[PDB]
């Protein structure tokens, strides 16, 4: 199924409006998504919107395109370290635009928007991940509420009598936990704001894992040309939990007319989402065939399969994207540039390969031979 | 195929009586077994019954429900450390009820019952394990005898002339090794008992791996409530070879009317086999749909898929089960209890999620909030 | 070994070397407590527009930015220069730091630091000279790539080379090779950039060459433990910052509100090098003799080494009490005595009864009075 | 280092401290052989109904239960209490031990031990004070959580804290905090529970918090090497008990039948701390000088350190000969000289001919006479 | 620690022990430089038909074959004999070595070496006596399985055993057991095989028992760095030879053509034990004081220890200059000062300007003149 002749700029194909936001869904059955083995979701969470606790069968990365807020990830078996003597809960993470959040499969996750603007969050679930032992699709298990599809929360699957016995509660509260008459969807409004505990042994190790890393801050660039742009990579050498999640991310900001050097992805598929600006992408496959040659703009997604070669040139407005890759420590090999396949070949190998002269072969490898990955012609 | 709407209490569907016992087979083609990616077998070995040497394409865990005896696992390339100057063979392991045995794929394994009672042994083979590079089903390779299906031993596949040449034996003994007229099946009788050598460098490392661990002894419980019962987990932090086998086990004994707190399996499927007593199981899926709600009793098996939520309440007679999980270090997340998803959430998150008051949300998380996993209402 | 310490005491810098654009305060690594912990500690103040010259050390280190902001450069040998502009400059990536940042510098890597704000930078550095990474002696050996520094004046390593071979090696003339040797420099290791310092700043090189070396632990939003009337704790180890698994050191930022307490605890697998950044507090430390080996206040600028396994207790004064601790292990762990995750809460009541000759009621009061509470005990 | 030992000798406890419900025998960790091995050894006898008070050590240890049965508690900080009853008590899981058990206690973890049988428990403990886990001095530092012990009397760590802060920390009154400090206790570290000791006993916490800490090696059925007329050997390392890969220690139970032999061997990657639990046997040890550094009997209660690489040989007397060895490495390995897995059997006959100036026949007799035999050589 | 070295100097063997079929030269492991590096070094010459008798050492080692060819045997305990012929002999696999080979021998494994060519074998061996594998003292302890050697004469380990028990252990008579003890041997540890030495040579045992122990680094075709007018470098670490990750040592073969240079560099994570195999060259070494601690020639047969972090520079004479270095770490790494992968090339021009008080032009000349060049700088 990865033998696809065409790529398209994808957009969500089904929206579900909840009380306090919307959830956009890309088609996990598209032949490109099946090739990469992922599902992607975009949510918008209005101010005072609360994304209800749920867990998924697939590990995921969340990129915060817009807004700020608090996220909660419950690590089972870990003690509650935030407390007041009044509440007690597990630590809460405050996020802002440019952040990447890593949620392991099987962990309960909730999200609250305490900002002035909507939070826009793009999520890529690796449904092909070895951690997922169910089928190759996103299975979401809701802990509260209900989601229009429709989707009831897991507690509704228990007889209220035993739910009452398990929780130690009278059958009327046990019934309430089943959320039967709820029609708010999976993003509800906290009308008068949500107050959580917030500042302003073995639990110091596994329970204190970092789940969030900012990649949008320009000061964090790994590659920088002041007339071309910047690239910021995120993998387990920055965020340790990604060695388990087995996915990487990349923030790319190209300035006016800048280019990302032609390259292929060595060990991963790349799921790119344009957050702003405009640019042309060109993708080439193993036949030597163009499989994409088009403009990408804000809100659109394109899947570049492993080993396909790819090229980008920003428009006059610049070009900003975030890419999720289906490997930890995802790597590219550039075709030309300082660290390139061609810069590493003997000149006579280039001469006989491309039927070129010595001077032409030297131009091929040495013209860009000192530039890393962001060009400016 | 893991998208199954119903679970049933399973039982073997085909029995094969051998000279000194029977082998029961669950249907590896059942949609639940295909979802979990396992095969299970139950054997009964009468006193003086010998299970003939064989090896399988899938790693396996064996739980000894009843009886005692000796097992032999040949580790290729390891020296024979049991010897008398008369025999010489590899070390032999003496097992009893409650033991779990781990047999890697590709290793030759035999079992002898030197007790007064039958040995009853349940086996779960992980046919989806990365160690299995054949097809996703149990392929058993018999080293001696023949098994009614029918199934000849691998030596019958060799021409007796070369079998004679390889072994260095005359063609009449080489013919005998092919077990042509044998009709005893895979469990034969050692009429006058089996005598093996038995007490009463690099081979100290890999060759001395522990393959057996007892989980039935109550004194070994990891979780204990004297009015509820006990839970005993087995993974690579107890038995190192399980990091390779990639499976875990659990012994659960619930006392009269006790409950196992609602939980889901984070990183594994759970294959439970009721060894005794009686209890009700309730299982809920990602739609919020009941997919099982029934009584389980001795000799029955139920497959709880990864991430499905599940609840058990023992009957008046108590309830004992053993579970095999398709991961090393298999973990659950409880919904309520001391280490629970809900105990870890801020109260206002619960209030807005379940449309509850503060007092009700506090009852939900704090009523059982000090109890670990075994309740007694 | 010097870990049979009769008494502990709070420490302050013994010698102070003034440079052109800052000062370096050295704690005495020959003090028994530093010798027991196997560390050397230095404090630096870098005035605005001051550049700490490139140098490398035999020991891995953690730097805590007490105050200020600026630019840090860590040169990873064999990694490409990925910051570049054409039309001028190319160099490796530069790291912009701020108050509360922890920086991890492996031994043997060249490092430099520039203050581009208008307030002075104050850095506290703990070097693990007992680390197996250091195969020299158990002392801080600093190798300057440029400049000179009053230890007695330590020269840069190029000064050790003959002029002719250095010219040959660098492919330049004798005059320039002589200037690299920095013969008559009087500025020290923190020098003034009077024109400001302009640098460029906003395959396999995406892996090891892109290791994060910096993590902020001062930000309140990052707390791992928090009680609104007691304070907060933020831990730093390899589960947050991967390189620490090679550095083999951890850090902790503790901020105690008025009159609050850190539960009595001992460090399980590490020594703790505690530095007070603000406020005032009472610290008591007990050893394996049951003797009080410290019972004193700590104030801003003072340092206290708490040895592994020693039990300790802290209470903020009316002003609060803030510190940063550096611990001599990756994934340093503590064991509390009382509280929700503590040694006593894990023991059967009757073990405690017989141990302390207590009634069941007294046992349950010792065990359950704080049994719900995290390490930050509200007054 | 003290490993240039002229002679070895069998060791016995130097000092003996009597407690209310038992005694603790200390071997001398300052002996050259203990200093060469980098260990401290203690033997304890715990009378019935005696409780060893909770304490923690700077060094990881292996305990071998020579005799008796009872209950052990190991508190893992930050793990939930999973033994609980409601209607009363909650604590961490308790471990029931018996003769032949090996218990592994990481440094820095609180540990207690109760004898609930009617015969005394005899425990032999080897502490690896050279372990990298121990960042204090190379001696056994024990930190009592309760009680007092004649080292000179060592107080518990709470005695090091001031009464007022301990009351504040524990959230209790001054009277109770004073009693925790155990001022006037005369019982020592093994105390009598006259009413018996009743304890409860039949997510992530299913992983590290559920580490097995105990493994039986005395059971004959567990042998790794067995000859019905020679005896048996049972090895304990991280391939059986995972925690040992962090403890970095291994164990071995050797039981030799009348007049049998353990093949000459050397320890490849560890020192061997050998303790005789019964019987009598001849041990000969040879060093790198070809000198006999030990040639003596061993009987019940005696200890012998065999340094790494030293070659050694054992022969039981007419009574048999039983020992337990503790080795200073995970996955400790030996190299036999003769036998099926040995150095000589692996060498070409002509190498042996030229090495010993032997005929081919003599070479083959040296090489093949025992060439079929495991390490237990029948008389 | 002795790593506060005022001066370095080139070393040569202090004592020389002559055997029947060769000689062993010992460098002085008590020299400050060897004590700083934590190594012992020996050179052996093995005449044709000479056999180095089987022995094992407390320290892991790397052997470099400077000259000759022959057969090596390493006995891995508990591995099957896989070289066998029936009709006679069976033994473990034998390793045929040649000039330029590096052999890695773990501590505690029996090793022997036979010269089956007609030119003498010259082996240079570096033993890491500071390796954590060695739990004895920090000196080279060699345990002979056969023979005797003038250290004073060291006996083989079997000489330490009583004759009667050795006979019993080996299952042979008293006369043969006495001959194994090699009482009156006068040959030393390299003995003549006058009839030649004939050996056999062309499951789990396919894994650990089949570890490669030998790798050639002398072959020009194997270069990692090469400039046709400067020379070549070939690195050996665990990315080529897996066992080195346990040996924790690396090697390097440097061959400099006439007048070429190795770029100024420091060793990041290891000491360097440099031995000159041919030619002549100038080495300059600088320390953390900026002092010249070495400035001399090196010629064939001389040894130089360069401590970790010390900066060093080498220039071949008109004859070229060849060496082998052994480094005290797996995956030993260097940091160049100038060149394509260097510290200075990674730094912003303005950092260099302010550091050395240089113009932008001077800065760019220091940074870019060699900025394209690998570690081998052509004259």
Protein model, in words:
This is part of a larger assembly, with five copies of chain A. Chain A is mostly beta strands and 377 residues long. Chain A has two domains: 1-215, Sandwich (Jelly Rolls), CATH 2.60.120; 216-377, Jelly Rolls (Sandwich). The first copy, chain A, is 11% helix and 40% strand. Chain A has six helices and 27 strands. In chain A, strands 18, 19, 20, 21, 22, 23, 24, 25, 26 and 27 form a ten-stranded antiparallel beta sheet that branches. In chain A, strands 1-2-3-12-5-10-17 form a seven-stranded antiparallel beta sheet, with no helix packed on it. In chain A, strands 4, 6, 9, 11, 13 and 16 form a six-stranded antiparallel beta sheet that branches. In chain A, β22 and β23 form a beta hairpin. In chain A, α5 (347-353) crosses α6. The interface between A and B is large, with 62 and 65 residues. It is classed as allergen. Keywords: 11S globulin, seed storage protein, allergen. Crystal structure of coconut allergen cocosin. Chains A, B, C, D, E: 11S globulin isoform 1. The organism of A, B, C, D, E is Cocos nucifera.
